[PDB]
Design a protein around this ligand. Structure first.
Ligand SMILES: N[C@@H](CCC(=O)O)C(=O)O
Length: 250
């Protein structure tokens, strides 16, 4: 009635994972304990974690937070979901929160909260063509669905995570990195020497948002929605944007 199991996934700066304080053995500052799918030990912080803390306090629930090890955000393969979406769909978690993109395919099988971060797809370049994404998420899904020819060309340039993609772009092994807009634009704002930009001064293609995934028909959607909408109006989400997503490059 009031304890929720919450799945999440590291994606800085929305979810950042760090070891517990070696001195105290606890999660200090603004961090909260989070265990692996596989209190204290690993600690989680970030924009989405601050949202979660506020939801817990406002609605009045306790929670158990864990990091997904079975895939990442969510992909359906041969009829089976993995990642955060899978955790919710198979009811291993009451909800999933992180940089989780709302799309049609996912919306069919889980309920999403109202979106609380605007996102989409952007293209990052250094300030035949080699362009890649990190596969298995909403970006690859969109490209495969709407631009199958281009998708087929991108497969050999798949990257394992954002950090490697950025390294490859900087080194010229990629000419462009195509990825979630909210993350890419943050990375552009934080880039050493400001050598990386997103096309169109941050143009967002395929506009959508991050949402909290809940069981289809979850009794939690309404309270979560009201709280998020309340946060938006109290300028609380704007504060969190300034706190977590600001950078110096512009
Ligand atoms: N936010 C994306 C992951 C990154 C991407 O594919 O752009 C998702 O939920 O699948």
């Amino acid at each position: 009635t009031q304890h929720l199991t919450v799945a999440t996934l590291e994606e800085r700066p929305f979810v950042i994972v760090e070891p517990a304080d070696p001195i105290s053995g606890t999660c200090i500052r603004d961090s909260v304990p989070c265990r692996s799918q596989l209190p204290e030990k690993r600690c989680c912080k970030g924009f989405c974690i601050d949202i979660l803390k506020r939801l817990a306090h406002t609605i009045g629930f306790s929670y158990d937070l864990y990091l997904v090890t079975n895939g990442k955000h969510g992909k359906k393969i041969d009829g089976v979901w993995n990642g955060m979406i899978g955790e919710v769909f198979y009811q291993r978690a009451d909800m999933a929160i992180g940089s989780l993109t709302i799309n049609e395919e996912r919306s069919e099988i889980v309920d999403f909260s109202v979106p609380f971060v605007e996102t989409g797809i952007s293209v990052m370049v250094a300030r035949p063509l080699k362009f890649g994404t990190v596969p298995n998420g909403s970006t690859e899904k969109n490209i495969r669905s709407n631009y199958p020819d281009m998708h087929s060309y991108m497969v050999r340039y798949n990257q394992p995570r954002v950090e490697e993609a950025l390294t490859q772009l900087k080194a010229g092994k990629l000419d462009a990195f195509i990825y979630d807009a909210a993350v890419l634009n943050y990375m552009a704002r934080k880039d050493e020497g400001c050598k990386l930009v997103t096309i169109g001064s941050g143009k967002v293609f395929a506009t959508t948002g991050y949402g909290i995934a809940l069981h289809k028909g979850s009794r939690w959607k309404r309270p979560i929605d009201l709280a998020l909408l309340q946060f938006l109006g109290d300028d609380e989400i704007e504060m969190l944007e300034r706190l977590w997503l600001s950078g110096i490059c512009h």
